[PDB]
Design a protein around this ligand. Structure first.
Ligand SMILES: [Zn+2]
Lengths: 140, 72, 54, 139, 189, 115, 101, 57, 139
RNA sequence: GCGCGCUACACUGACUGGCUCAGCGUGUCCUACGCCGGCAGGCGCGGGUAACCCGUUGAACCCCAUUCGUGAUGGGGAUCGGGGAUUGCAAUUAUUCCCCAUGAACGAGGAAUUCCCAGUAAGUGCGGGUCAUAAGCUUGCGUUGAUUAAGUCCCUGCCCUUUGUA
């Protein structure tokens, strides 16, 4: 309703370009590793009003949203929401964000390709790895 | 073409709304958003705020279509 | 020997079941405990009691 | 004036407001996080959904008696959309229905039946019929 | 007395042309509280002539795949549309509907006599029922199509369409199509 | 190396029970249901094949039709010949492949080249 | 003598109606308290299978129905009289089941 | 424990059918026409209708 | 002192029990205005507006609805009410008054007294519905 | 490269909450009720060989509020990474099932071509058959519910009668 005095038009968080125009709950879905569910609970756990547009958030609020997004375990986000539950190497629970998720994916793909596991070979050839029929469909 | 509608009111649009909206033959979230280049949510919020002041009458309320009108 | 002849378990599955008439294991009607091939049922439908009305 | 005589939409909102004002309804720890079924995509928008669900549950139990967790799971069921697979009827969450009935038992509004289900108590019937009274009075 | 949605009178409405005077039902003895009748008006020939024109509109409204049997919603679309109509123009919506159907109906059509591939058409007259049919069909397709992918709703799109159609505005889809069909009949003759 | 925050040296000494939860849900269920005769028979063959081997040179190949055997800390270092339906495919069981099956490391069909 | 009930179940209607009517008029003439035929919902067994053995045709289907008609007649009479009235009434194409309390 | 009315009436159907198939393959030579089965809890009777009974005895 | 008649649409059935009293109107213990499909509220008000409340003055009707769907139930209940009134004004009033009611009810819509007989048609093999067939591909 | 299909391309729509109605028919495997887990499910104790118990079969579209706003978007959910359960002796080429994450084509489809006349078309769920695990299939059942036609032999074929034929 009221005119915004300092509307931050573009947000620069976690090496991502967040559009303040979209509502905050859906605004932060643009970050890879964050969906329409995890975004909601993150904001609710920080007790921010979801009604607010992403452009009209103060420095401390967005800094709280970043720090609660990084380390979820500290702020009582359940175990069954974490993107990475049991990490193959170190075996701990964590939420992996854009750069981390890309790095973790290529690492997991490399790990499978290293041992010559069927999934790895099916990945290396650029085929389906969930056991669909690849005859009739899935062209290009 | 791409329609770049305004999320929040600017002074040039806000004063234009408070003066001119108040007197149109038909009042609704659609026509206001189209004419003044406003977002659907802000245009829907604006009509609710004008009803709280008491410049505009609510003709019939519904999920899909909320119809407003000028008085006298 | 004794422990490899009919050794494979058949409690469930298509191989465990068979037609009561011809001992075939394809297109088997196991509703109401008919336990009979669809071809054999069509032959014995009349004298069982099943009638064609509409 | 009785629950049946008033509008059933406004009645739930009135009863929810009463259950909030009482301030003695044991809300779980996971209200902020958990969905309300297998087939919902997001968490409920309203922050005070537990009170509206509790109010709804009480009203359902007023209208007919001997309603268990399974029945309440059957009440709040809906349409599961399975992407490219066609849509089928899915049931509600059992835990939320159980915790709601446990929480309402806490108020002494509902008690267990000798037959096996859960019926509304005369204290409950009083509260529900009173809420109906002022909901009717507000027109 | 009987009034549509218990708030629109059916006495002050007036028909212009005698040709359609017995093919637009909305009058004293056809006065209904709601469009929704669930009658057997498509049972045999010339029975839908006795269907209320508001029912014909709301029936022809639920057309495309996703809304095939969603009448309860077209009735509220027509209800909102009628309210929008009254707010915009001022007078009885039923008069605007009748005026729209009067204007929109093509008077001379073209019929195919010849072979497939080649175009060779004879210009012929249009029956009063077929005039009413095409008028309703064109109005709904104009409404529908106009509001498919833009913000204004079906209710105010249907209203806008009937406002334009009733006063014979070139902007109306139904008027453009009528004009074109009569121009093609004029091209053949 | 480490698996689920546990280095191999204490995977070896770790018993059958607390090894269960470290594995993924499928394997955990399999170990819960318990191994039959032929699985134990293979383990016995593999530990013997390792025990009799030299300390420098790798254990001698142990051939098998068991594609559905889970890799265990016991099996790390072993030379397994897995049956693909036609022939035997020789695999050296590395520490990193301690979650999967034998079947995954012996491909059944030839990769398709079009013409 | 207390509450013997008689469950008559058949596939034919005519034979079932005839035999049950005979049991009723047989009981009525002896001056015995009888609660009349309680007709339960007719059980219809449906089997729908392809006509063809091979599977080449226009995909035609048979529709095999099997009807089960069930009647209950209730008596407040002694077991000695119930035994002989149940004994005399036999018919090929009806099943009779007698229960006490 | 007793089976359902539905399964019972089916079971009697298969009994009839299988008995007929057996009787046909046995008494085909003696012109076996048909069979009639009457069931009583005391004792169930099977009645064979054939062309030349002197032989089938 | 009372009469009891049924109104029927598709598989919907609404039984109205009509006795003497203070113009009471209840369906499944709920008033007409509080029936869920409010969009068609007028369809329930059809028989009472056509005749006028004055005729309902000395009549309490209690309607109970079972089977069918929402709109089918609406057509069952609105049929049942009118059939109940004409049955009562037949039995305990002159035939002239019954005729004076009947002619008005029939003249408006024949559906109010005479039941719509058509039912959901049986489906045949070779297609999805009762008439429609699956797509037939040549080459 | 073709042939049945299912989900879509959104605002007459998604999402969140509230309200209120079925019918066919199946259960020696169908399941009520109580407890624990977010959920898939885990335990304990009952009813039913069935108008008796599941079950008053509280089904979905639809109806009424909330949020969204023409943006490949809170349309669409393909493909892919982690986990957590149930069958089964055995699940990897992932049987089904659940959770978080990833977010492709697709803006109504060229030549061409199918099906259909009233409780019909179409939307929309539910039960049966396969069934240890089990429906994008078929076979049934309700539910909401239309537009257009009451005609013609033009196309594609059919029946009868005349002729013509190497
Ligand atoms: Zn057979």
């Amino acid at each position: 309703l009221v005119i915004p005095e300092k509307f931050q038009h573009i947000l620069r968080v976690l090496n991502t370009n967040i559009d303040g125009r979209r509502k905050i709950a859906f605004a932060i879905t643009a970050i890879k590793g964050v969906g329409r569910r995890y975004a909601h609970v993150v904001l609710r756990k920080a007790d921010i009003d979801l009604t607010k547009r992403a452009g009209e958030l103060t420095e401390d609020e967005v800094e709280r949203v970043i720090t609660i997004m990084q380390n979820p375990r500290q702020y009582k986000i359940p175990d069954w929401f974490l993107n990475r539950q049991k990490d193959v190497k170190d075996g701990k629970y964590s939420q992996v964000l854009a750069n981390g998720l890309d790095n973790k994916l290529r690492e997991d793909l490399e790990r499978l390709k290293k041992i010559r596991a069927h999934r790895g070979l099916r990945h290396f050839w650029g085929l389906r790895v969930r056991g669909q029929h690849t005859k009739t469909t899935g062209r290009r | 073409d791409k329609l770049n509608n305004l999320v929040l009111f600017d002074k040039a649009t806000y004063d234009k709304l408070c003066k001119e909206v108040p007197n149109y033959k038909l009042i609704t979230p659609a026509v206001v958003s189209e004419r003044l280049k406003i977002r659907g949510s802000l245009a829907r919020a604006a009509l609710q705020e004008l009803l709280s002041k008491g410049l505009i009458k609510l003709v019939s309320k519904h999920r899909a279509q909320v119809i407003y009108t000028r008085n006298t | 020997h004794q422990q490899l002849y009919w050794s494979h378990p058949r409690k469930f599955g298509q191989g465990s079941r068979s037609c009561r008439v011809c001992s075939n294991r394809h297109g088997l009607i196991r509703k109401y405990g008919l336990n009979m091939c669809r071809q054999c049922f069509r032959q014995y439908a009349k004298d069982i009691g099943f009638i064609k009305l509409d | 004036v009785t629950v049946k005589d008033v509008n059933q939409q406004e009645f739930v909102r009135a009863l929810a407001a009463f259950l909030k004002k009482s301030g003695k309804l044991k809300v779980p720890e996971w209200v902020d996080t958990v969905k309300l079924a297998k087939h919902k995509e997001l968490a409920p928008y309203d922050e005070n959904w537990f009170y509206t669900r509790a109010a709804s549950t009480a009203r359902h139990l007023y209208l007919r008696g001997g309603a268990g967790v399974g029945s309440m799971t059957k009440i709040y069921g809906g349409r599961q959309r399975n992407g490219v697979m066609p849509s089928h009827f899915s049931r509600g969450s059992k835990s939320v229905a159980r915790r709601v009935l446990q929480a309402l038992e806490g108020l002494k509004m509902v008690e267990k039946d000798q037959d096996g289900g859960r019926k509304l108590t005369p204290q409950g019937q009083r509260d529900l019929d009173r809420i109906a009274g002022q909901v009717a009075a507000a027109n | 007395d009987i009034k549509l949605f218990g708030k629109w009178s059916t006495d002050d409405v007036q028909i212009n042309d005698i040709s359609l005077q017995d093919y637009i039902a909305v009058k004293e003895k056809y006065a209904k509280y709601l469009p929704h009748s669930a009658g057997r008006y498509a049972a045999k020939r010339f029975r839908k002539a006795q269907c209320p024109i508001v029912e014909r509109l709301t029936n022809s409204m639920m057309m495309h795949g996703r809304n095939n049997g969603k009448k309860l919603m077209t009735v509220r679309i027509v209800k909102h549309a009628f309210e929008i109509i009254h707010l915009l123009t001022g007078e009885n919506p039923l008069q605007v509907l009748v005026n729209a159907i009067i204007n929109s109906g093509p008077r001379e059509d073209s019929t195919r006599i010849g072979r497939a591939g080649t175009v060779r058409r004879q210009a012929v007259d249009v029956s009063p029922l077929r005039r009413v049919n095409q008028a309703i069909w064109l109005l709904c397709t104009g409404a529908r199509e106009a509001a498919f992918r833009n913000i204004k709703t079906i209710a105010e799109c249907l209203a806008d369409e009937l406002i334009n159609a009733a006063k014979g505005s070139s902007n109306s889809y139904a008027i453009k199509k009528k004009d074109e069909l009569e121009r093609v009949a004029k091209s053949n003759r | 190396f480490t698996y689920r925050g546990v280095d191999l040296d204490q995977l070896l000494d770790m018993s059958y029970e607390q090894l269960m939860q470290l594995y993924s849900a499928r394997q955990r269920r399999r170990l819960n249901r318990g191994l039959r005769r032929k699985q134990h028979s293979l383990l016995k063959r593999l530990r013997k094949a390792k025990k009799e081997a030299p300390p420098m040179e790798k254990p001698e190949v142990v051939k098998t039709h068991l594609r559905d055997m889970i890799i265990l800390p016991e099996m790390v270092g072993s030379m397994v010949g897995v049956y693909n339906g036609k022939t035997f495919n020789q695999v050296e069981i590395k520490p990193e492949m301690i979650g999967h099956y034998l079947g995954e490391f012996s491909i059944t069909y030839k990769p398709v080249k079009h013409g | 003598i207390h509450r013997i009930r008689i469950t008559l179940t058949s596939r034919n209607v005519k034979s079932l109606e005839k035999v049950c009517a005979d049991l009723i008029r047989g009981a009525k003439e002896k001056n015995l308290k009888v609660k009349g035929p309680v007709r339960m919902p007719t059980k219809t067994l449906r089997i729908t299978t392809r006509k063809t053995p091979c599977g080449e045709g226009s995909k035609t289907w048979d529709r095999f129905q099997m009807r089960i008609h069930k009647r209950l007649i209730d008596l407040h009479s002694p077991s000695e009289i119930v035994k002989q009235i149940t004994s005399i009434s036999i018919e090929p194409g009806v099943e009779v089941e007698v229960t006490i309390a | 424990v007793q089976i359902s009315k539905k399964r019972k009436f089916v079971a009697d159907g298969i009994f009839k059918a299988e008995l007929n198939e057996f009787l046909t393959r046995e008494l085909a030579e003696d012109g076996y026409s048909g069979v009639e089965v009457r069931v009583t809890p005391t004792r169930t009777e099977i009645i064979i209708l054939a062309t030349r009974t002197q032989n089938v005895l | 002192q009372s009469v009891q008649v049924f109104g029927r649409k598709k598989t919907a059935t609404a039984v109205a029990h009509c006795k003497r009293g203070n113009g009471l109107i209840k369906v499944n213990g709920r008033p007409l205005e509080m029936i869920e499909p409010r969009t068609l509220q007028y369809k329930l008000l059809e028989p009472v507006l056509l005749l006028g409340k004055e005729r309902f003055a000395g009549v309490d009707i209690r309607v109970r609805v079972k089977g069918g769907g929402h709109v089918a139930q609406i057509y069952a209940i609105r049929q049942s009410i009118s059939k109940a009134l004409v049955a009562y004004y037949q039995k305990y009033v002159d035939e002239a008054s019954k005729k004076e009611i009947k002619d008005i009810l029939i003249q408006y819509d024949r559906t109010l007294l005479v039941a719509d007989p058509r039912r959901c048609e049986s489906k045949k093999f070779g297609g999805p519905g009762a008439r429609a067939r699956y797509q037939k591909s040549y080459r």
